[PDB]
Amino acid sequence: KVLTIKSCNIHSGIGIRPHAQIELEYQGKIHKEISEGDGGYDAFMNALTKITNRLGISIPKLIDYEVRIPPGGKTDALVETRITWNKSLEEDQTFKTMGVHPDQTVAAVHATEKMLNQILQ
Amino acid sequence: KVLTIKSCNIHSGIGIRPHAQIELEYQGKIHKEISEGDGGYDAFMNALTKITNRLGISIPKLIDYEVRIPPGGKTDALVETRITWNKTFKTMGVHPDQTVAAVHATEKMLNQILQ
Ligand SMILES: CC[C@H](C)[C@H](N)C(=O)O
Numbered sequence: 756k757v758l759t760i761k762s763c764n765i766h767s768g769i770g771i772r773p774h775a776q777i778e779l780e781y782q783g784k785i786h787k788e789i790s791e792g793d794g795g796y797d798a799f800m801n802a803l804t805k806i807t808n809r810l811g812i813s814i815p816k817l818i819d820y821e822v823r824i825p826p827g828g829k830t831d832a833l834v835e836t837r838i839t840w841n842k843s844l845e846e847d848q849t850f851k852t853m854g855v856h857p858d859q860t861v862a863a864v865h866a867t868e869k870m871l872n873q874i875l876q
Numbered sequence: 877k878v879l880t881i882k883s884c885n886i887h888s889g890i891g892i893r894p895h896a897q898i899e900l901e902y903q904g905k906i907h908k909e910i911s912e913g914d915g916g917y918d919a920f921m922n923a924l925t926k927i928t929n930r931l932g933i934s935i936p937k938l939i940d941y942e943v944r945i946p947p948g949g950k951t952d953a954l955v956e957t958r959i960t961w962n963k964t965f966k967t968m969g970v971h972p973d974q975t976v977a978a979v980h981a982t983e984k985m986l987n988q989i990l991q
Pocket residue numbers: 792793794795796797798820945950951952953954955972973974975
């Protein structure tokens with residue numbers, strides 16, 4: 756845990772321009788950023804990118820996005836989100852991170868946070 | 877389309893308690909509700925359930941939930957969500973925001989149930 760997403764607020768809905776706030780801590784420094792996007796997660800990634808650029812960190816390209824719930828999980832089901840990344844470019848640098856949470860967007864933020872640390876660590 | 881979801885606002889994140897607002901039109905009546913949940917969509921359905929309960933409508937149980945983006949993945953990718961219900965059928969939603977894609981499928985399920 757060298758990079759932590761202290762908090763984030765994600766907005767979306769019908770009649771709403773999606774947006775997200777982020778507050779991440781890295782090396783005794785806290786970065787707060789906001790951005791709109793075509794979707795909540797997209798907005799979250801756009802805000803994240805302004806931070807990583809500042810830090811000189813390159814974010815891998817999102818190659819695959821998978822979401823699943825256990826059978827008969829229902830509305831409050833735990834969501835498993837698997838995101839596949841690629842640093843370049845073709846297969847040799849492809850990897851996946853995963854997140855599990857009752858909110859599907861948080862699950863994605865968690866998988867993204869894991870990715871960030873794997874790249875930094 | 878018999879039932880229309882005029883608007884809805886969903887809010888989640890780390891450090892926030894998931895909540896959602898919904899505004900729907902049915903049989904010449906406007907219904908507006910709010911509620912928290914374990915997740916945005918969960919909050920949305922909790923708010924929807926208050927409405928359906930008032931209408932005497934029982935919502936089908938959510939059995940499976942599928943989310944996919946087209947090949948050549950990108951953060952701003954369109955989301956295609958397929959939800960499976962059982963009292964067993966399926967509804968679909970397509971939208972750049974994945975929570976909205978689910979809501980669209982939920983709206984479809986609703987209209988299909990209120991026939
Ligand atoms: C990977 C696609 C993402 C999840 C979608 N565009 C959203 O912001 O909801």
